[PDB]
Input
Amino acid sequence: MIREERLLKVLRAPHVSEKASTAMEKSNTIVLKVAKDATKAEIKAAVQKLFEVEVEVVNTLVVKGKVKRHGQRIGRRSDWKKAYVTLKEGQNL
Amino acid sequence: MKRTFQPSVLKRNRSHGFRARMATKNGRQVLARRRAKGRARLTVSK
Amino acid sequence: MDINWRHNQSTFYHFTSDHRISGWKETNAMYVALNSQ
Amino acid sequence: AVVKCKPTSPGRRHVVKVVNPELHKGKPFAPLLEKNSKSGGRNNNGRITTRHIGGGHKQAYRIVDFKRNKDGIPAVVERLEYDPNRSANIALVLYKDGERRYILAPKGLKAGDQIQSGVDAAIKPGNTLPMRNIPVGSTVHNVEMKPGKGGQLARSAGTYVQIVARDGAYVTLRLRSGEMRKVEADCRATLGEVGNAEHMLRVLGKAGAARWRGVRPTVRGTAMNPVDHPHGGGEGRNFGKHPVTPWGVQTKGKKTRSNKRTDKFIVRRRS
RNA sequence: AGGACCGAACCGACUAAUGUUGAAAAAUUAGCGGAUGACUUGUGGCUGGGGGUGAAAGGCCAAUCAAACCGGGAGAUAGCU
RNA sequence: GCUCGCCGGAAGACCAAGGGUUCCUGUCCAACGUUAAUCGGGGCAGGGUGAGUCGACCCCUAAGGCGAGGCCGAAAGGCGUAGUCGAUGGGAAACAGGUUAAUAUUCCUGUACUUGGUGUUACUGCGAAGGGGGGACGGAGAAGGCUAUGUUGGCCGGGCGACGGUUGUCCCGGUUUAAGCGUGUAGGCUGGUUUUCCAGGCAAAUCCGGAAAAUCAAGGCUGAGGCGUGAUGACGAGGCACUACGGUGCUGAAGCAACAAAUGCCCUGCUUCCAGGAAAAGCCUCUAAGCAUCAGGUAACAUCAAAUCGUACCCCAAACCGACACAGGUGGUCAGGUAGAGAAUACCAAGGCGCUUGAGAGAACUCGGGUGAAGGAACUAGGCAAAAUGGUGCCGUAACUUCGGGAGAAGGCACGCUGAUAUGUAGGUGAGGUCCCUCGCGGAUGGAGCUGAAAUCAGUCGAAGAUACCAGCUGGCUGCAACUGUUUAUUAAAAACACAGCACUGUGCAAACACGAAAGUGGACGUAUACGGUGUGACGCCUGCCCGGUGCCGGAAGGUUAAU
Output
C-alpha cells in the first residue's frame, strides 16, 4: 500500500484534447497530467481510490516543455508527466 | 571537408565534465575560477 | 542582429598561411618574390 | 623441412617457409591458455620505451612449465603444437596421474615418448634432473639460474648448453653465446637440445611477413633530422659522425655491461 | 595459394580546365592509382610542449607548429619607425 | 488537376551519432528566405512522443581509468594490490492486421512467449568467494540443400477499345498471410552402455581427467528449410450505402503450380594455410563448511509482479560538422523489371524531386561541348589537351628471363535478325503411374511439364550487327628504384622513406636499452636461431689496399694527477 498524502499529491489535472475525447469515448481510457516523479503504481492506486473506477493499466510519458520567448526574453516551459489510465466497463464523471 | 569539431557528448563529458574537473586539483582551480568570475554555465555538463 | 559582424572580422587576425595575402587573398606574390632575388 | 615457393608473385619469390607435418593441426589445450594483450612497446607511462613494436596477429599465451618440479611421475607426450610466443615448439604432455602440461620440446621428442623427472629419471632427451646428476659434457637445455626458479637458459629454437666442468658446488656452463659462467649445482635442467633448429633457415619473403609478426618499420638514423637523431641532414647522404644510438650513446663497439653483481659467476666472457 | 590480374563500393590524389572578393579558408568536372591486404572503417581509450608521434617531410599535435593553445611576469626590451 | 523532365545501389526508405520541437493543425507577413509571398524548417497559440517483449537501466568483463591498505616522492603528488568503474562485446521473451492530422513490435483486434516472488500438491538430499564444462569466437576457398525475391502459366475480376486489326497463342490488375506450437528433414559433429581403480583438478567430490575390463554396434548432440496448426481469421481487386466531397460506413471472387535465384540461412559448419586466431558473467554439473524428520531443490497447477528512462521529427541532410536554407564531410540496414558477368552502365517500378530570382535579345569575349575540306605534331619546354583503342570466343604471338613471366605481346577472323538441324538442341529441374522396405519429409524407376545455352547450314537488311551507355592505344632504345606499399592534410608522390635480404656491434636476464628524482613499467610473461642500436637495401658476380688522425676495444710497466 501507499499512504494517503503521497497518493494525493500525484493526480494534478485532467488533460483535454480531441485525441483525449476519442480516447475517452472509443477505447474507454483517460489521459491526465500527473506528478513529475509519480510512478504507474501510485497513479493506479489513486484512480482506484479517488475516482472509484476499475482501473486496468497505466501508460505514462513525460512531455518536455516547449521553448517560448516572451518579448525578447527566452524561456522554457516546465516539463510535465503525461499518463494514460484505462478502465473496464464503468464511468460517470 | 571533415572539420575539427565532430561532436560526441560521451567524449565531451569525459574530457571537461564536472566529475573530470573535480577528479584533480587543477580542475578544482578551474572550477574556483568559474565561481570567482561568476559564470552561469560554469561547466560544460549541460 | 549583427553581433556576428563584429565576430566575423576576427577570423584572420591570427592567420599563418604565408602563400596568401592576409590568410585569404590569393596572389602571385610567391613568383614575384622568387624572381625578385 | 624447408620448401621454396614458386615465384608466381613478386612477393612470393624469396620466401622459404619451414613446414612440419608433425605439428598439431587442431585447437590447443583449453585450460592452459590465458590472455596476453599487445603492448605496442609502450610502458605504464604510455610513452614508447622500445620502438619498432606494434601490430601483428593476435596471440594467446600458453603456460609452459619451465619449472618441471613434478618429480618422479612418468609422463607421455600427447602431441606437438605451435607456440606463437616462442621460436621453439611446445609439447602437450600427459602425466601418469592424468594431468596435462606444456613442456618445451627437444629434438627427438614426438608423440608417444616417455618423459620422467627426478634423480630416478633416465639420461635421455626430455628428462629433467638436478645439474649435479648430469654427466659432464652432455647436451642440455632449459637451464635454471637459481634453484626452483624455472628454466631460463637455452630456451629458443636450436639452442643447447654444454657442461664443461663440475666443481660440486658450482658447474661451469659454456652457453650458446660462447660464454663460460658458473652456475650453482642444484639447478634443474633438461637433457638434449630443443627441436626447431631449422627456424633460422626461414626467410620472410616480403614486408608483410615482418609486419604481421608484430615488427614495425625501423627508419635509419641518416634519413632523420638533427632534432630527432644525432645523424641527420647534410643535403644528401652525409654522415660525418661516429655512429651512435638515438640517445647519443656510442654504438658499434662500446661495451655497456655495468652489472657488478653477477661478475663473480662469469668465468670468461664471450668473444 | 598469391603484400596476384581487370574492375564498382571504399581509400587516395597523378594530369589538365574552371574557380581563385570561389559553390568551397584546397573544391568541382573529364580522365587516374590501390581495391584480401604493410587494406579500410565505426566506438572508446592511451601517449603533451623542448614533450608526444612520425614506412622521416622538421611532417602532424583542434583551419595555428624550426617548439601548440590560454592566463600570468608584462606597461619585457626596442640606440628603430 | 493534366502533361514534360530528373534520381531510382538514390537525389528512394529506416536508424545510430549528433540536433533539441524543426513534427501536426489553426493563424500573420514586421524581420529571416540572396526576388514577389497568400508559402516556410519564419512569428503566435494549441496539440502530439503511451513498452514485461524495442533501446537504455541491470549482470559480466576487454583496452584503460580510479584505487582501501602498500611502495616511492621537497610539497602538490606518482605507481600499484584486494576491489570498483568503464561497450564498441556476451546475457529472458511479440508477432500479423487496423487506427491518428501528428504515436506504433508501445494503442486496439487476434494469437503468443519469457523471468522472478508467493501459495498448494507430489518426490527427496540441499548447500560456495572453490573445481570442471560451456560461454569461446583467425584468414581464404568450395559447393550442396534452401529461403527471401522475381518470371511464366493456371484461376478470379474487368475491357472489345479515339486511327488499319483486335473473342484472341488478346489487353489490365490481383493471386497475400507473421510470431508461436507440433512433426522432424537436407546436412554437420561424436562410437555407445555398464563396471573397477587412481601420486592430478590447492582440501573434498558421484563432476573433469587418467588407467583397466565387459558388452553392443547403436544411440546422442546440433540443424536451415518444407509441412500441419495458428488461419472456415485478417487482407483482397473491386462493388453497395452516406458523402463534413476530403473521404466515410457496409460487403467482398480467385487466392495455385512450375522455373530461376541471392552477398540472407544451414554455416560459431566443411576443406585448407600459417601470421595459430578476447575476458568474465548468465547457464550445466561437482562437492567443502554447515543444514540435516528443517533449511532447501525438483515437477504440476494457481496467483502476483516485470519498476524507471527514450519513443515526435531530420539523419548522405535546409534540421549534424562546415560563420550561410553552402556544389563539401558523415557509420549501419533494405535493394525489384529489361539488357547486362556485375552493387558497372542505360532506360524504368515503388517512392521523391524540377535544385528561392525570372522574362527577352541571339554582339564581342569567356566557360562546357558537337562537327570539319586538305595536310597530319609542322604547335609547344614537352603529343599539355584533344583525338583514337575498348567486349566475347577462336587462331597466333618475338627478344629477354629469376622459367613464374613478358603477354590481353603484337596481329587477324566471326558477332544482328529469320528458318531448319531441334513444331527449342545438349543440359538442368522434375510430377503422374509402377515396384520395394524400416514403412517416411523414404529408396529404385519413369518421363509428362517447365527452363534452356552453344554451334552448323540456309536466307535476309543496312554504309555500319561488341551498332546506344559502358568499355586497354601499341611498339622499340634507355637512366633511376628490385617489387606491393608510405610521405610534406592545403603548390613537391619521386630517384625520397620503408621493405624482405645482408653485415657489424651490444646484451647471460634483476639483461642491454628506454620512460621515470624514486617506486615501478616496457623490453618480455621473451632467454643469444632472442632482443636492441647502426649501416646497406631483392637476386647474380663481388666487395681490393691503408689503423698515420678521430672513435672504440684490450693492457698495465713507467710519467702526470683530485678530494683526503
